[PDB]
Each structure stands twice: as C-alpha cells, then as structure tokens.
RNA sequence: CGUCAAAGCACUUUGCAAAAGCUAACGUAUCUGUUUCUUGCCUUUUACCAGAAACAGCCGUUUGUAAGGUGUGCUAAUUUGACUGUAUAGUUUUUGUAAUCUUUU
C-alpha cells in the first residue's frame, strides 16, 4: 500500500516518539519500516528546544504522525482584433426568411 | 499500409540462406581502408587518383633538392591518408576513419559441432614465457 | 620554422589545428625528417691542447666512448648528481669495474643533467693544487652543459661521451681566470677531441609492433627489409589467431610505412611505432671520397656522409665541414 | 529503501546518535549496514549523567538505535525511485 | 536479510562488550553469527563492584548485545 | 506478472502543421533544371563534355494533431501511462521486557 504515506512527503510534521519527545520538520524520505528522514529538526522535551539538523528515526521509536503545515514551495491563438465599423442593413426581418 | 515488419529468427535465417549468392562477405570494414567515400573525396580534391577508383576533373626557394633527404619516394596513397601532413595547401579535403576493431567471427562451415567449440585456428594459449611474483 | 612531434599521426593533427583552428592560413609543409644525434666511436689519437684568449690557462681532456650498459642507466634515473659521491662511486665500481679514484672524480652529467655525457678528473697535480681547481668548478660546467647541448657536426645533442681533465695550467689571480675567458675556451676543448676521436651520427629507431594473419606475413618481411628492419620476434600470439611481428625501423625510413602495410595486406595488419633505442649510422660522416648525387638515395657507409651535408645545408652552416682547423687549436 | 542509503552516504563524516540505553555517541563513521549496525572511531559518549568518555572502536546493533543525526549537505543527496526487484536504490537507465 | 556482519576484523582479538542490564564482558573473539550471537574465550566479568571473575569459553546472545569495543588499537 | 489512472480498440482515408536545437544516414536510395564561373568538342543557337559555388524542382520517409471510413466491443475488449510492488508471530524494526512503585527539584 503506502499510498497515503507518499501524500505526506515534503510537509512539516509533528512526530511523537515512544520516549515522549516530539520531533518537527519536513519529510524527505520514508520506508516500509516507517523509518522517517526529517529536515531541519527540533525536539521539544517537556519550555525547551534543541537544533539537530538531519535526523533519521527508526520504526521502533515512532508512535504517531501529524501534519503541522502544508507542503512548501497555449501561447497565442489565431484570433486578431480590428477597429470599428458598424454597417447598416437595408433589409429588416430575420436571417432565413426574406 | 505495409510499413514496418518484424521477422522471426528462423525466417530471417532462410532469407539469408536463400539470398546468400547476392549479399556480401566482409563484416570488418577495415577491408575498405583506401576505398571509402572520404578517401575518394580527397583524391578528387588533391587531383591525384587512386588505382581501382574513380578519376575526376581537377577541382583547382623553399623546396630545394639539396635540402631534402630522398628516402622512399612518397606515394599517392600516403597523401590520401594524412593529407594535412604529407601534402601542402590541402583544401576541400575530408579526413577518414583510422581503423576499426577487427571482427573475429568465423562462421561454422560444418554445422554439426556445437555453437561453442574451440576452433583449431586459434593458437594454443600456452604461457611458459612468463615470470610472475 | 622546424617543429617536432612523436610521429605521422601526431604531425597530421598539429598541421590541422594551426592550419584551420588557430591561424586560418595556407602553408607549404616540407617532407618530414628525423632529429639526429651524434657520438664518438673510439679514443682520440692526439691529446687535446687549448689556450684562453688571455693565455694564462691551458686545458686538455681526453674523449672515450662509454659501454652500452652504462648509457641506458643514466636516462632511466638509476644514478643522479644529487646523490652523495660515495653512493655514486659504489655504482660504477661494482657494475662496470671502474677504478677507485676514477669513480669518485665524476663532476657532472652531460647536457642539462640527463644526456649521457660525463666529466672526470685524470691527474695528480689536482691533489697538489686542489683549492686552486675548486675555483674553476662551474666555469667548466657552464661551457660543457651548454657546449654539449649543441654539437660539432649538425648543432645537435651528444651521447655516450666521457671527458677526462688531464693538464690544467693556472695563473696567480682569479681576475685572469674569468667567465668570459674560460667558458668559451672550456667548450672548445670538447669540439677538438671529437674530430680526433672519429665521430658518427646516431638516429632513432622505433619498435613497430605489427599484428597480422598468417598469410600476410611474407609481405611484411619483404616490406621491412627494404627499409632496414630487424624482426626481434615473430609468434602466433595466444588466445587469438594473429601473428605478432615486433620490429625496429629507422625513423627516416618509416615515412608512411603504416599506409603501405594496410594497402598491401588488404585491411588486415595494423602497426604502431613507439620511440625506442638509438642506432648508429653505418658509415663515417667525415669522408671526402664518398659524395654521390642529390637525386637518388644512399646504400651502405656512403649514406652517413649524405645525411650530414644535407642536414647542415638546411640549417645554413658551411656545407663541407672543412673548417675543422678553427676548433683544433695550432700545431 | 532510502532511509538506509542516506546512512551509508554519511560514512566518513562525523555522526551523532541516540540509543535505547539513553546515551548519545559522536564520531567518524566507518561502516554501516542494512540492519543499522555501525562502526565508528574516536567516539565521545555522553550519557544521562553528562559523563564523558572515549572509545577507540565500536560496533553496535541497529535494534538498539533510536535515531541518528547527520551532516547538513546530506539533504541535497539524490533520492531515487528504486524498483520492485532491487535492493539498493541507485540510478536506473533500463526499463524500470 | 541476514547480512552477515563485518566482524572478521575482530576475530582472535580482545574485546570489551556491553550487554543488557548494564553488564559487560572481556574476551577473545572466536566466532559470530547472522543474528550477532558471539563466542568468547577467556571470559572475565566486570561486576558493578569491579570484582573480576574468570569464567572461560562463553556464548553471548545476539539480541542482548548493545555494542562491542577494542581495548588496544 | 501485479496494482492505480486515462482512453473505446485494432486497421484504415483525407485535411493541417512541423522534421540538425550538442557533427549528423529525415532517404544505408538517388534524378532533372536555373544562375554564376571555370575547362572540353565546336561554329548555327539549341542539344551536349565534366568540375566548382548559389539556388531550385521532382520521386519518397517520419512525427503530432483534426476529422472521418471498415471490423469489433460501448451488460466489454484493447491500448496507453504511472507506481516508495510481495505475506515474516521464534534474536537487527509491525504480535511488545512489559507492568508497577518510590524519592529528589
């Protein structure tokens, strides 16, 4: 399967681990064991913070996943114009009759 | 519409074997050496002519015999190989493919012995000349 | 504007670039020739004599040919000037059985510290006046390494020539022994010893390694022999039905040897030429009775004289080389 | 899988990691594994206490690793498509 | 699977193992496993006291192992 | 082979567009003409000899796209793409060494 997991790719995530710690950052790479790779990571042990960088977690260590934010980031047809004119028709009445 | 065709192996086999009397027997290309479409261009440009080949219209102080060293005349074959070297004022010339790998495939004449059978034309392979570590 | 380069194919691609990439200009290329070199065959009969322009110093040295085992070792880099004198003297004594005082007395190697020429001391008065000779170390080398870079015959390099400093007459001050008064006379001593010692030209040969089928062989031999060829080895090489034909050829007589192989053997038989060796020209380059004709080629010993006149003709030197009396001092 | 190849690519650089033990290790990485074994040198350990030490050579078991911390240039590295019948990611010229 | 680990360079050399329950052992590395089960000879405990008891030939389980060190370069 | 997405499908007729982007057979084929020059054989110009450069035609080839035709299916078949595609309860991840208590700030 893993169809849902590809959809998460390149989003800022909030990942709770078995220790209780919570890592945060974008998701670059993903596995069948749920090994996650995360970019520009920050733990929140708890009024606390730390800067790590690139972090590769195991599957054993991970508990839950949750998105913090969204993913980060016919030329010219034939037609031609002209000016005015607005000719008057001598005849009245509809197009087909006469 | 009859564009595009795909032929089985055994079919192409028969066609080959039926057409045999027409199609060639070279496989190498080295054979041509001085008989390539390039060589013949230079001949035309240098106004020289090679023996078996064609011959066209022409297209188009420092020498001193006492300064030269006469050792083996220098033939026309030599000018058509290295036109920039052996020949001066070389224009409108084409340079040719210098050598190809050389094919080492002899087709099986007697078709009973298998596909992979050490042929008697290959030299034994003995190595008593060598001195190793 | 004579320009050099490894061989036919190399020269083709220069004269392609300069003709169509760099300059966009027509040319009159000449028929290619080899770069010659020059050596001594035997010892000199008459010992040398030389005077400085000031006549305060007299230099004399003997020229002798080296053994062929030695010459190769220097160009490989088995022996240097930068090593200690004791390590260098151990080399010659144990391989070629030189004397003990002769082995230590090596000054410096030939043209630009590689070319197979050697300086040496052969005298006793040097032991008496040792510190007097040590003021004249570099004044000999700067007229020797510059003076043997170029040569007597064709203004070319020299091979296998030893030098043996015999007599050295000296003056009181070191102002009488100047750079301008020693160097251009110290160089003249080499050219004088050459003419007495009977010199000859040497030319390069390169190893032609042909490949071929068995049937083509006879044509290869018949082609080679006409251009002076010595087959070193002919074998059916293993694992593939081809005969190797290693060979040697004198560079002057390999002008287009490749294209004649490929023609005559109909697309079989490839050949390469890898610089090797240096082979001496059979005849003597200084012989007045030889001169033949400027149109037809030469054959035996008469060929050596032919190259010399022609080589000097191209340079713009005196053609006869009869001005040997200029460099031979006076007696 | 890509989470393993990134590891193999940080061989040579200096790595930080965390084990079930509780301690963190820092050093040059020499060899890794698909298991997540490791082989490091000049390691500078720091436990829960804060106690520093030195360990010349070390082997590990992946099972015991919680997570790694890897150099910054290892985010521009290529992440390939892999395939159904291949172990190592690598780039792929052929069919698919 | 079953990547036979790179323990060839530790064979017939002294070690300083660590295992589960903060217990550790010294020994000559005889043989290893797919699952990292180990064979140690001349096995000496390192008790929490520091009292070193000689045992002999011993087979440590793979699961347990935390790490494996070298005493001498 | 497996999944997902798109689409009728295979075969065919016309129309309309393109076809050196980094030195290379749109065509492993190959013919005529115009102009400008050079040489041939020549005096009637044409018709020609055989080289060059510059332009042109003609016989063909490929691709995309649009509308059609025949046969088959629109209660199906075929094509086309895309893909982080495999199954493991017994030691390195998904069938747990967990559970529980207490003290310190």
Name the residue ranges covered by the structural domains of chain E: 1-73
Angstrom distance (rounded) from CA D8 to CA E3: 15
Method: cryo-EM
Q: Beta strands D14-19 and D65-70: pairing type?
A: antiparallel
What are the tokens at A14?
A: 């909030």
Torsion C42-C46-C52-C57 (CA) sign:
positive
Q: Give me the helix-helix angle, C257-264 and C217-225, nearest 10°.
A: 150
Choose among E27, E54, E51: nearest CA to E41: E27
Backbone dihedral angles phi then psi of residue E36, each to the nearest 5 degrees: 75, 20
Beta-carbon contacts of C118 under 8 Å, excluding residues fewer than 6 positions away, are C66, C106, C107, C109, C110, C161, C162, C163
Q: Does residue C118 sit in helix, strand or coil?
A: strand
Q: Is B in contact with A (3 or more beta carbon pairs below 8 Å)?
A: no
Backbone dihedral angles phi then psi of residue D42, each to the nearest 5 degrees: 55, 45
Query: How many independent structural domains does chain D possess?
Result: 1
Q: Which residue of C has its CA nearest to B91?
A: C26
Find out whether C34 and C252 touch, Cβ atoms under 8 Å. yes
Q: Which residues in A lie closer than 8 A to residue D74 (C-beta atoms)?
A: 54
Find out whether A65 and A15 touch, Cβ atoms under 8 Å. yes
Strand F: positions under 7 A of a protein C-beta atom? 2, 11-13, 39, 50-53, 61-62, 83-88, 91-94
Beta-carbon contacts of C114 under 8 Å, excluding residues fewer than 6 positions away, are C74, C75
Angstrom distance (rounded) from CA D44 to CA D26: 5
Backbone dihedral angles phi then psi of residue E61, each to the nearest 5 degrees: -75, 155
Q: Does residue C283 sit in helix, strand or coil?
A: coil
Find out whether B45 and B92 touch, Cβ atoms under 8 Å. yes
What are the tokens at B106?
A: 């002899």
Number of cross-chain residue pairs from B and C with Cβ atoms under 8 Å apart: 116
Distance B27 CA to F14 C1' (A): 45
Strands, E, within A1-98: which ranges? 12-17, 22-30, 36-39, 42-43, 50-51, 54-57, 62-64, 67-69
Angstrom distance (rounded) from CA C88 to CA C70: 13
Angstrom distance (rounded) from CA D61 to CA E63: 8
| C260·B75 Cβ contact <8 A | yes
Q: Beta strands D52-60 and A50-51: pairing type?
A: unpaired
Find out whether C288 and C324 touch, Cβ atoms under 8 Å. no
According to CATH, the topology of domain E1-73 is: SH3 type barrels. (2.30.30)
Residues 62-91 of D with CB under 8 A from E: 63-64
What are the tokens at C182?
A: 């020693």
CA distance to partner chain A, nearest, from residue D91 (Å) = 16
> Which residue's structure tokens are 């899988």?
D1
Q: Which residue is nearest to nucleotide F86 (CA to C1')?
A: D84
Distance C112 CA to F20 C1' (A): 54
Choose among C314, C302, C317: nearest CA to C34: C314
How many CB atoms sit inside 10 A of residue B77's CB?
20
Q: Give me the helix-helix angle, C179-186 and C188-197, nearest 10°.
A: 20
Dihedral over alpha carbons C258, C259, C264, C265 (to 10 degrees): 60
Find out whether C319 and C313 touch, Cβ atoms under 8 Å. yes
Q: Which residue of C has its CA nearest to B90?
A: C26
Q: Give the containing element (helix H, strand E) for C159.
A: strand C158-159
Q: Which nucleotide's C1' sits nearest to the alpha carbon of E5?
A: F92
Choose among C227, C237, C321: nearest CA to C273: C227
Angstrom distance (rounded) from CA C102 to CA C104: 6
CA distances from A50 to A42, A45, E6 (A): 6, 9, 34
Distance B18 CA to F34 C1' (A): 48
Q: Beta strands E54-60 and C233-237: pairing type?
A: unpaired
CA distances from C162 to A43, C130, C190 (A): 82, 22, 10
Nearest-CB residue to C240 (from B34, B62, B122): B122
Q: Give the containing element (helix H, strand E) for D93.
A: none
Torsion A62-A68-A70-A73 (CA) sign:
negative
Distance E63 CA to F101 C1' (A): 28
Nearest-CB residue to A58 (from D65, D69, D75): D65
Backbone dihedral angles phi then psi of residue C254, each to the nearest 5 degrees: -125, 15
Residues 52-71 of D with CB under 8 A from A: 62-63, 65-71
Choose among D16, D42, D31, D28: nearest CA to E9: D31
Strands, E, within E33-66: which ranges? 38-46, 54-60
Q: Does residue D21 sit in helix, strand or coil?
A: coil
> Which residue's structure tokens are 């000016």?
A83
What are the tokens at C295?
A: 């149109």
Find out whether A97 and A55 touch, Cβ atoms under 8 Å. no
CA distances from D23 to A53, A84, C13, D18, D49 (A): 19, 84, 67, 6, 9
For the purposes of burial, counting CB atoms within 10 Å of the CB of B49, is it exposed (0-12), middle (13-18) or buried (19 or more)?
A: middle
Angstrom distance (rounded) from CA D69 to CA D75: 12
Q: What is the extent of the structural domain holding A33?
A: 1-98
CATH label of the domain that carries residue D35: 2.30.30.100
Residue A9 C-alpha from the chain's centroid: 8
How many CB atoms sit inside 10 A of residue C40's CB?
24
Torsion C215-C220-C223-C228 (CA) sign:
negative
Choose among C254, C263, C273, C255: nearest CA to C219: C263
Query: How many independent structural domains does chain A possess?
Result: 1
User: Is some CB atom of chain E closer than 8 A to the CB atom of D56?
Assistant: yes
Q: What is the extent of the structural domain holding D81?
A: 1-96
Q: Which nucleotide's C1' sits nearest to the alpha carbon of D63?
A: F92
Residue C34 C-alpha from the chain's centroid: 12
What are the tokens at B58?
A: 């022409």
Choose among C13, C12, C40: nearest CA to C190: C40
Q: Does residue D51 sit in helix, strand or coil?
A: coil
Q: Does residue B24 sit in helix, strand or coil?
A: coil
Angstrom distance (rounded) from CA B78 to CA C89: 52
Distance C302 CA to F36 C1' (A): 59
For the purposes of burial, counting CB atoms within 10 Å of the CB of C192, is it exposed (0-12), middle (13-18) or buried (19 or more)?
A: buried
Q: Which residues in A lie closer than 8 A to residue D79 (C-beta atoms)?
A: 28-29
Find out whether B82 and C7 touch, Cβ atoms under 8 Å. no
Beta-carbon contacts of C89 under 8 Å, excluding residues fewer than 6 positions away, are C100, C103, C104, C106
Residue B45 C-alpha from the chain's centroid: 21
């Amino acid at each position: 399967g893993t169809t849902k997991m590809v959809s998460l790719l390149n989003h800022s995530l909030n990942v709770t681990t078995k220790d209780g710690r919570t890592f945060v950052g974008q998701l670059l790479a993903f596995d069948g064991f749920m090994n996650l790779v995360l970019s520009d990571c920050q733990e929140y042990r708890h009024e606390e913070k730390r800067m790590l960088g690139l972090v590769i977690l195991r599957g054993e260590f991970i508990v839950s996943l949750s998105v913090q934010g969204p993913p980060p980031m016919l030329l010219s047809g034939p037609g031609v114009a002209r000016p005015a004119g607005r000719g008057i028709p001598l005849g009245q009445a509809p197009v087909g009759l006469a | 519409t009859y564009r595009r065709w795909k032929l089985n192996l055994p079919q192409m086999a028969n066609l080959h074997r039926l057409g045999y009397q027409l199609l060639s027997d070279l496989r190498d290309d080295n054979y041509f050496y001085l008989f390539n479409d390039n060589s013949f261009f230079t001949a035309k440009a240098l106004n020289v002519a090679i023996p078996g080949g064609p011959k066209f219209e022409p297209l188009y102080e420092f020498n001193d015999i006492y300064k030269l060293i006469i050792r083996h005349p220098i033939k026309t074959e030599y000018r058509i190989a290295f036109p920039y070297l052996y020949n001066s004022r070389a224009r409108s010339v084409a340079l040719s493919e210098y050598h190809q790998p050389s094919n080492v495939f002899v087709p099986p004449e007697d078709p009973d012995l298998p596909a992979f059978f050490w042929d008697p034309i290959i030299n034994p392979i003995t190595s008593r000349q060598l001195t190793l570590h | 504007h004579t320009i050099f380069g490894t061989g036919e194919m190399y020269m083709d691609c220069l004269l392609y670039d300069l003709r169509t990439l760099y300059s966009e200009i027509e040319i009159r290329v000449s028929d290619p020739v080899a770069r010659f070199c020059e050596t001594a065959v035997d010892t000199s009969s008459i010992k040398c004599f030389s005077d400085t322009p000031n006549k305060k110093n007299r230099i004399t040295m003997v020229v002798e040919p080296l053994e062929k085992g030695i010459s190769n070792d220097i160009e490989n880099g088995k022996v240097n000037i930068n090593w200690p004198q004791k390590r260098i003297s151990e080399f010659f004594q144990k391989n070629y059985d030189w004397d003990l005082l002769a082995s230590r007395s090596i000054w410096a190697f030939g043209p630009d510290d590689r070319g197979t020429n050697i300086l040496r001391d052969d005298t006793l008065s040097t032991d008496v006046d040792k510190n007097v000779l040590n003021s004249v170390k570099e004044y000999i080398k700067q007229g020797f390494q510059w003076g043997t870079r170029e040569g007597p015959l064709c203004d070319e390099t020299i091979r296998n020539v030893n030098f043996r400093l015999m007599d050295v007459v000296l003056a009181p001050e070191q102002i009488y022994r100047g750079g301008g008064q020693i160097i251009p006379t110290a160089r003249r001593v080499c050219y004088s010893s050459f003419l007495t010692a009977s010199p000859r030209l040497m030319e390069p040969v390169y190893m032609v390694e042909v490949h071929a089928p068995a049937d083509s062989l006879p044509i290869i031999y018949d082609l080679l022999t006409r251009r002076r060829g010595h087959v070193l080895q002919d074998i059916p090489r293993p694992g593939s039905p081809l005969y190797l034909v290693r060979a040697l050829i004198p560079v002057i007589d390999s002008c287009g040897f490749e294209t004649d192989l490929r023609v005559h053997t109909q697309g079989q038989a490839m050949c390469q030429m890898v610089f090797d060796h240096w082979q001496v020209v059979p005849g003597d380059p200084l012989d007045k009775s030889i001169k033949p004709k400027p149109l037809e080629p030469a054959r035996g010993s008469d060929l050596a004289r032919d190259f010399l006149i022609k080589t000097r003709r191209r340079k713009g030197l005196v053609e006869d080389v009869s001005t040997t009396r200029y460099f031979d001092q006076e007696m | 899988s890509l989470c393993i190849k990134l590891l193999h690519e940080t061989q040579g650089h200096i790595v930080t990691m965390e084990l079930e033990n509780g301690s963190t290790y820092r050093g040059k990485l020499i060899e890794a594994e698909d298991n997540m074994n490791c082989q490091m040198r000049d390691i500078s350990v720091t436990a829960r206490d804060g106690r520093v030490s030195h360990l010349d050579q070390v082997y590990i078991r992946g099972s015991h690793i919680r997570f790694l911390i890897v150099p910054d240039m290892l985010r521009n590295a290529p992440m390939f498509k892999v395939g159904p019948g291949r172990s190592v990611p690598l780039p792929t010229r052929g069919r698919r | 699977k079953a990547g036979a680990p790179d323990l060839k360079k530790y064979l017939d050399r002294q070690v300083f193992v660590q295992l589960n329950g903060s217990r550790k052992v010294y020994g000559v590395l005889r043989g290893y496993d797919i699952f990292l089960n180990i064979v140690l000879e001349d096995s000496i405990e390192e008790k929490v006291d520091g009292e070193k008891v000689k045992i002999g030939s011993v087979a440590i389980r793979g699961n347990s192992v935390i790490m494996i060190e070298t005493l001498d370069k």
